[PDB]
Amino acid sequence: SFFSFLGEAFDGARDMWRAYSDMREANYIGSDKYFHARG
Amino acid sequence: SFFSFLGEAFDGARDMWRAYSDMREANYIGSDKYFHARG
Amino acid sequence: SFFSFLGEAFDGARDMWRAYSDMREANYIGSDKYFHARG
Amino acid sequence: SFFSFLGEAFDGARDMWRAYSDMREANYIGSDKYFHARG
Amino acid sequence: SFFSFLGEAFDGARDMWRAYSDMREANYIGSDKYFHARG
Amino acid sequence: SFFSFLGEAFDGARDMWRAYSDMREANYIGSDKYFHARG
Amino acid sequence: SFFSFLGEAFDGARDMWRAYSDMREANYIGSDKYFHARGNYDAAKRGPGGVWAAEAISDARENIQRFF
Amino acid sequence: SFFSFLGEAFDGARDMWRAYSDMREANYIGSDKYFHARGNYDAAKRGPGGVWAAEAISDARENIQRFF
Amino acid sequence: SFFSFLGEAFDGARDMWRAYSDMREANYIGSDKYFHARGNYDAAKRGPGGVWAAEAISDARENIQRFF
Amino acid sequence: SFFSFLGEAFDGARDMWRAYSDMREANYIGSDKYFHARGNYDAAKRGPGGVWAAEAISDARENIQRFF
Amino acid sequence: SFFSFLGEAFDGARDMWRAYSDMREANYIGSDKYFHARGNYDAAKRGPGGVWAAEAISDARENIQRFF
Amino acid sequence: SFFSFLGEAFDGARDMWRAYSDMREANYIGSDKYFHARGNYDAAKRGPGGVWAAEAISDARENIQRFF
């Protein structure tokens, strides 16, 4: 549960939760990045 | 459950939740990025 | 459940939830990006 | 549960939670990065 | 539970929790980085 | 439970918790980094 | 790029590749099955699935071969 | 890039690759099964799955071969 | 890059690779099964799975071979 | 890069690789099974799994071979 | 890079590798099973798993071989 | 790099490697099973696991071989 939130029976407040993640080029199962110069 | 929210029996407030994720080029199952210069 | 929201028996407030995701070039199952210069 | 939050029967406050993670090039199951210059 | 939070029956305060992690090139199960120059 | 937090029946305070971890190139199960120059 | 192949000079090749596959219910970017569903009885007899490959190479004076 | 292959000069190759596979319910970027679901009975007889490969190479004076 | 292969000069190769596989319910970037689910009965008879490879190479004066 | 292979000059090779595998419920970057789930009964008969390889090489004057 | 292999000059090789494997429920970067779950009964009959390899090489005047 | 292998000049090799394995529930970077879970009954019949290798090499005037 990446960057998840959970609560029960709770009162809130201003800016109670803030997340500032960066996921450029992320969460890659089998995607390769390669080159093959035989020349 | 990436960047998910969950709650029960809870009172809210201004800006109770904020998320600022960046997912450029993300969540790739088999999509490769390659070049093949035989020349 | 990416960037999902869920709640029950809850009172709201101004700006209770805000999401600012960026998904340019995202969620790619088999779409490759490649070039093949034999010359 | 990476960067997850959990609570019960709790009162909130301003900026109660803040996360500033960076996940560029992260969470890679089998995605290689290589080159093969026979020439 | 990397960088997780948990509590029960607790009152909050300003900036009660802050995390400043960096995960560039992190969480890699089998993704190699190599080159093979036979030439 | 790397960099985890846990508490019960506790009152908070300003900046009650701060973490400043760096995980560049971290958490690698089988991902090698090598080269093989037969030439 | 699943089951990718590359080559040069296939001079005289034979039977180079046999990609038998069952991609049923596959490649779903966004989807929700039985989302907010209550009381649904799911008895679909999806039955056999996947490859059921058989290959018999037999030389004889008399021969009897049966498949499936 | 699953089951990737590369090569040069396949001069005279035979039976180079046999990629039998069952990719059912695979490759899901975002999905939620039985999300917020209550009372759902799930009895699908998904049945056999995966590869069931058989290969019989037999020379004889008399022969009897049966598959599945 | 699962089950990757590389080569040069496959001059006269035979039976180079046999990649039998069962990738069912695999490769999930984001997913949630039975998320927030209450009372769900899950009896799916997923049944046999994975490879069930058989290979019989037999020479004879009389022969009887049976598979599955 | 699971089960990786590399080579040069496969001049006359035979039966170089047999990658039988069961990758069911594998490769999950982000996922949550039975997340926030209450009362769920899970009786799926997932059944046999993994490789069930058999290889019989037998020469004879009379032969009887049975598989699975 | 699990079960990695490297080589040069496979001139005349035979049966070089047999990578039988069961990667079920494997390779999980982020996941949470039965997270915040209460009362869940888990009776899945996952059943046999892993490799069940058999290899019989037998020469005879009369032969009887049975597998699984 | 588990079970790594390296070599040069495999001129005439045979049966070089047999990597049978059971990688179930393996390779977990971040995960939490039964996290914050209360009252969960866990009776999964995971059953047999790991390799169950058998290898019978027998020459005879009459032969009877049985596996599993």
Numbering used by the authors:
A (entry chain G), B (entry chain I), C (entry chain K), D (entry chain E), E (entry chain C), F (entry chain A): 2 to 40
G (entry chain L), H (entry chain J), I (entry chain H), J (entry chain F), K (entry chain D), L (entry chain B): 2 to 69
Publication passage describing the model:
Serum amyloid A1 (SAA1) is the precursor protein of AA amyloid fibrils. It is an acute phase protein that becomes strongly upregulated during inflammation.
In this research, we determined the cryo-EM structures of amyloid fibrils that were isolated from the kidneys of two patients with the vascular variant of systemic AA amyloidosis. Stack A is formed by residues Ser2 to Gly40, while stack B contains residues Ser2 to Phe69, reminiscent of the two groups of fibrils protein obtained by mass spectrometry. The fibril proteins in both stacks show folds that are dominated by β-sheet structure and lack the α-helical conformation of natively folded SAA1. These very different z-axial positions of the N-terminal ends of the fibril proteins lead to the different tilt of the sheet β1 relative to the fibril z-axis, which explains the different directions of the fibril twist of the glomerular and the vascular fibril. While the glomerular fibril shows a symmetrical distribution of the positive and negative charges in the fibril cross-section, the vascular fibril presents a clearly asymmetrical charge distribution.
